[PDB]
């Protein structure tokens, strides 16, 4: 029943022609609401969910300024990282970071995150106390020392308890019909004979929101963890997700197998068999 505002930020040194030096996407839960980027120093912003049409013009003007400022600061951060890691000039490197706040059903704050990565690996993380940091190496330990000597987490908490809460509250109100919901999965088993003579049973789940789901196959009394093929949960493109899991089974044994579906929109696990 909790809800989160999350931003996924990426900064690239030496992107390709036409490719962003800085891009960030913002989500509430599993619904994207905007894109921001900067290409050759030009900032651009696009809405992605319907409630964003209710934002006023100063939201987008303040956001444009924030994009310019963050893009310059991230570029400068990339240059310092290059030097502290004694890396060569001329290559392209990647700095990513995630910013989030989370509230419960009474709209009370539960937590928040700030975490950064260099070239695809953890670099520094804010701990759940929202006051201290965890580093991975001696360069990120310099960062930790600077942030703690400066008290920088204070300004992050000011962002969490100010603008993060402000926007999460307003987006949940204006986007209530999209965001305060759980669509349950529509489930079924499909059956595909194989040329060898055995059968693929493929348990499908479609139309569900949010994305988190579990699909499991089980036999009369045998464990199938190592036997089933599971696909990564995937967007259908209209706001809902889909997934499947399959096992290959001998012909004539199909009713021995049951597929179980677990999802927030269900009160108990769905249990499906073929046919």
């Amino acid at each position: 029943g909790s809800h989160s505002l999350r931003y996924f930020h990426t900064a690239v040194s030496r992107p390709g022609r036409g490719e962003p030096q800085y891009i960030s996407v913002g989500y509430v839960d599993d619904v994207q609401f905007q894109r921001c980027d900067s290409i050759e120093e030009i900032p651009r912003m696009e809405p992605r969910a319907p409630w964003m049409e209710k934002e006023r013009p100063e939201y987008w003007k303040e956001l444009k300024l924030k994009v310019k400022n963050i893009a310059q600061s991230a570029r400068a951060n990339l240059r310092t990282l290059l030097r502290y890691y004694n890396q060569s000039e001329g290559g392209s490197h990647i700095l990513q970071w995630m910013v989030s706040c989370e509230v419960g059903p009474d709209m009370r704050l539960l937590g928040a995150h700030y975490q950064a990565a260099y070239d695809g690996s953890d670099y520094i993380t804010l701990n759940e106390d929202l006051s201290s940091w965890t580093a991975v190496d001696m360069v990120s330990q310099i960062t930790k020392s600077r942030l703690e000597s400066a008290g920088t987490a204070e300004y992050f908490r000011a962002y969490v308890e100010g603008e993060c809460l402000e926007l999460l509250h307003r987006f949940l109100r204006n986007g209530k019909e999209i965001l305060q919901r759980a669509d349950p999965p529509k489930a079924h088993v499909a059956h595909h004979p194989r040329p060898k003579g055995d059968v693929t049973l493929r348990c499908w789940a479609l139309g569900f929101y949010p994305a988190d789901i579990t699909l499991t196959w089980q036999k009369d009394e045998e464990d199938l963890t190592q036997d089933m093929e599971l696909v990564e949960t995937r967007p259908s493109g209209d706001g809902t997700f889909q997934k499947w899991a399959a096992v290959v089974v001998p012909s004539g044994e199909e009713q021995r197998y049951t597929c179980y579906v677990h999802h927030e929109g269900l009160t108990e696990p769905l249990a499906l068999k073929w046919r």
């Binding site: 913002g26 991230a74 951060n77 910013v99 950064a116 960062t143």
Partner: peptide, 7 residues
């Protein structure tokens, strides 16, 4: 929409 300069 927040960034911390790490160095």
């Amino acid at each position: 929409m927040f960034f911390i300069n790490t160095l």
